[PDB]
């Protein structure tokens, strides 16, 4: 009759009554996402209303088993995830504001449209329209317009909410004994009471910062190169020593420089690798793509997709009548129901983002035997990073000749590989400064190191100093650009993208060292390599049952985030970029800008 025993029994009733209420919610949240009908909108919310309420009922219950008396750490971990009474710690009057804010902000972001001056007849959502401009248009002013009208006409509306947002979120974070809300988000990485594997929340701000410093040489040289290439596409607008204008970066924010590849391809004479065409000819379907993806995981030992996965998953798109959300998603619905929902076209880029999603499913299925509460990746970053290494290994030319979608008559000279590495650098390396900033700006705001009358001042200062990016129009404290990005105005942490990037190359170096790969890491392909599979699975099956520093060390042999594999993956590019820059300027002046003022 000790509190630890009593806690086990309570967790053991919670594990059986949640597996079904969480299955009723997943099961109903699938229908809204495949049949989109106002009826199914209601069956979903009720199911989630039942689930959401059940948790807080159990939440208040779990608190009468204090961790101070719990020794079995899995037991301690479950009680912890459950004892966190969360946002209800406010008065009921404030919780109504907080959730109405979050919903108001979300409904502004999704429904904001801007209309064009020289044609008010046409109005554009971000969803399909502005994003098409910010990805393809080569006209400076049109890009300038869609950039600036968004951050003003829609970003200003979020400014007041965002203030009230921060104010309430801080109250909740302090009540829970976190010093600020950013500190609350840092708790995701937090590990205690395990020797040599602990990890405090304040240890993340250092490690993210110490690791960013070893990125700078690579980025600076990527920055300088892309600048020189942009300074052709926009001859009279860019300074060869000035920051990059924020609206010229390939998408609405500059999160990924992916779309700048044509304006920055190294050896543009070389025919690019795009197997979109070889599939059509040998007749491939979403059935084949996902049957192929399944094969890759079986070559490394992992289990093949469950019988009910083939029967209940939505792989194609009925379309017309039914109306699904076509965002590729992976689903752990409960009770063995694993499903991937992707409206898959026969592209290649949809074949590689299906190896990503099945990585999820493969991972979800490994730690499926854990207790209910311990069913999730080791940290926020673990779970997307398991997916990226699958795309890395399947995109490789070595792999596409195995499956037979690339011609054996393809010549892999150095130039095609620098072309492949740079397209990777625009995405992977691009977003690291962008991501590190955006959190550090929030971390500070929530810490109060940035007052309201310096919000947009210190945002664009940090864009200039940290990122080498400048605004094309000066912005005052009436703007609120951060919340013009989807993560910001939807209440989601964003450092997850920084740490996932670093993890994936740690993982990929290891799994490709156990596959006895000889060559540059970028050509690796862990296929046919069951020694690779086994080392991955050993971490996958843990779930969050172990401290994330131990899961990472089960794979790569280190207790922490490590940049040395990142730089290593891109070093054949780095060294080419350096030579390419011998007469360019590398760096940027913090106080240039594309405007008179």
């Amino acid at each position: 009759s000790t509190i630890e025993e009593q806690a086990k029994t309570f967790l053991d009733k919670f594990n059986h009554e949640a597996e079904d209420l969480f299955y009723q919610s997943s099961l109903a949240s699938w229908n809204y996402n495949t049949n989109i009908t106002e009826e199914n909108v209601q069956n979903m919310n009720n199911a989630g209303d039942k689930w959401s309420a059940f948790l807080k009922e159990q939440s208040t219950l779990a608190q009468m088993y204090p961790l101070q008396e719990i020794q079995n750490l899995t037991v301690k971990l479950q009680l912890q995830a459950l004892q966190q009474n969360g946002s209800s710690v406010l008065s009921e009057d404030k919780s109504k504001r907080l959730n109405t804010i979050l919903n108001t902000m979300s409904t502004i972001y999704s429904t904001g449209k801007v209309c064009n001056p020289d044609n008010p007849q046409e109005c554009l959502l971000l969803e399909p329209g502005l994003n098409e401009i910010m990805a393809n248009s080569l006209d400076y002013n049109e890009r300038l317009w869609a950039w600036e009208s968004w951050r003003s006409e829609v970003g200003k509306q979020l400014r007041p909410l965002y203030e009230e947002y921060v104010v309430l979120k801080n109250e909740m974070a302090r009540a829970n004994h976190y010093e600020d809300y950013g500190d609350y988000w840092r708790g995701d990485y937090e590990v205690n009471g395990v020797d040599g594997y602990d990890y405090s929340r304040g240890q993340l701000i250092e490690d993210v910062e110490h690791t960013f410093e070893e990125i700078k040489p690579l980025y600076e040289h990527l920055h300088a190169y892309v600048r020189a290439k942009l300074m052709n596409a926009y001859p009279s607008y860019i300074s060869p020593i000035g920051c990059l204008p924020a609206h010229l970066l390939g998408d609405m924010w500059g999160r990924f420089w992916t779309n700048l590849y044509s304006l920055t391809v190294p050896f543009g004479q070389k025919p690019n690798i795009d197997v979109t065409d070889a599939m059509v000819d040998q007749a491939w379907d979403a059935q084949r793509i996902f049957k192929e993806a399944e094969k890759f995981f079986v070559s490394v030992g992992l289990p093949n997709m469950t019988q009910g996965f083939w029967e209940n998953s939505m792989l194609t798109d009925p379309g017309n009548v039914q109306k699904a959300v076509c965002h590729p998603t992976a689903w752990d619905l409960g009770k063995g129901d694993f499903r991937i929902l992707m409206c898959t076209k026969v592209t290649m880029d949809d074949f590689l983002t299906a190896h990503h999603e099945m990585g999820h499913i493969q991972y979800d299925m490994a730690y499926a035997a854990q207790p209910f509460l311990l069913r999730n990746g080791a940290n926020e970053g673990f779970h997307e990073a398991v997916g990226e290494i699958m795309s890395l290994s399947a995109a490789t030319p070595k792999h596409l000749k195995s499956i037979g979608l690339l011609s054996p008559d393809f010549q892999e000279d150095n130039e095609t590989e620098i072309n492949f590495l740079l397209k990777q650098a625009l995405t992977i390396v691009g977003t690291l400064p962008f991501t590190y900033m955006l959190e550090k700006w929030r971390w500070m705001v929530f810490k109060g190191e940035i007052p309201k009358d310096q919000w947009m001042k210190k945002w664009w200062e940090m864009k200039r100093e940290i990122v080498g990016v400048v605004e094309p129009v000066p912005h005052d404290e009436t703007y609120c650009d951060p919340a013009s990005l989807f993560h910001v105005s939807n209440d989601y942490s964003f450092i997850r993208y920084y740490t996932r990037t670093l993890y994936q190359f740690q993982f990929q170096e290891a799994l490709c060292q156990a596959a006895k790969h000889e060559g540059p890491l970028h050509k690796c392909d862990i296929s046919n390599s069951t020694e690779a599979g086994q080392k991955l699975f050993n971490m996958l099956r843990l779930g969050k049952s172990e401290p994330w520093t131990l899961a990472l060390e089960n794979v790569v042999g280190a207790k922490n985030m490590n940049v040395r594999p990142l730089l290593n993956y891109f070093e054949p590019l780095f060294t080419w970029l350096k030579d390419q820059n011998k007469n360019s300027f590398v760096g940027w002046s913090t106080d240039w800008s594309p405007y008179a003022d």
Binding site: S1, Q6, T9, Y23, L27, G308, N312, K335, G336, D337
Partner: protein, 188 residues
């Protein structure tokens, strides 16, 4: 002389919940022991103490048969010497079993879209079950050091819990019907 009604035990439409598992006593008769092999439906069919062919050429003093429904992750506990909620608190087989555990998947019947909750199991008990023991007490479990007064509350749980059988589980969580044949007048 007389035929053993094993079919009406395998062919029955309704099954008992595993905590109140059924038992039918088959005696003074004779039936076929190979009509249970080339059925090719039984996913599980492992004799743990006897052999199907020999059974025909042996007469037995007592043939008992038990019938129930459990989830797929749990038919492994209908085996001699295992531990798990089902084998500790619902149906226990002895360590000197001479018999046969036969099972198969019954989603066709026992799974309904949106819920099938008729089948129960006993989640908590005050001790483990003697072999072939049946506990049907709907009496409150005192997990705590606080008495329960026939009232549910802190560290006081109702002992039966409900199986949720949906036709989109994994084989993992789908319904399954089990039969446990136990073992000088019943010949072959």
């Amino acid at each position: 002389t007389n035929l053993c009604p094993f079919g009406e035990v395998f062919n029955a439409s309704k099954f008992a919940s595993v905590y109140a598992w059924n038992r039918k006593r088959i005696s003074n008769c004779v039936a076929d022991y190979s009509v249970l092999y080339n059925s090719t439906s039984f996913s599980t069919f492992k004799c743990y103490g006897v052999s199907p062919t020999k059974l025909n050429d042996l007469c037995f003093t007592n043939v008992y048969a038990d019938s129930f429904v459990v989830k797929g992750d749990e038919v492994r506990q209908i085996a001699p010497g295992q531990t798990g909620v089902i084998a500790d608190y619902n149906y226990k087989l002895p360590d000197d079993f001479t018999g046969c555990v036969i099972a198969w998947n019954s989603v066709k019947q026992d799974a309904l879209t949106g819920g099938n909750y008729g089948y129960l199991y006993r989640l908590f008990r005050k001790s483990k079950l003697k072999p072939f023991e049946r506990d049907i007490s709907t009496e409150i479990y005192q997990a705590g050091s606080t008495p329960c007064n026939g009232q549910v509350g802190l560290n006081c749980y109702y002992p039966l819990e409900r199986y949720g059988f949906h036709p989109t589980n994994g084989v993992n969580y789908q319904p399954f019907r089990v039969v446990v044949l136990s073992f000088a007048t019943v010949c072959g």
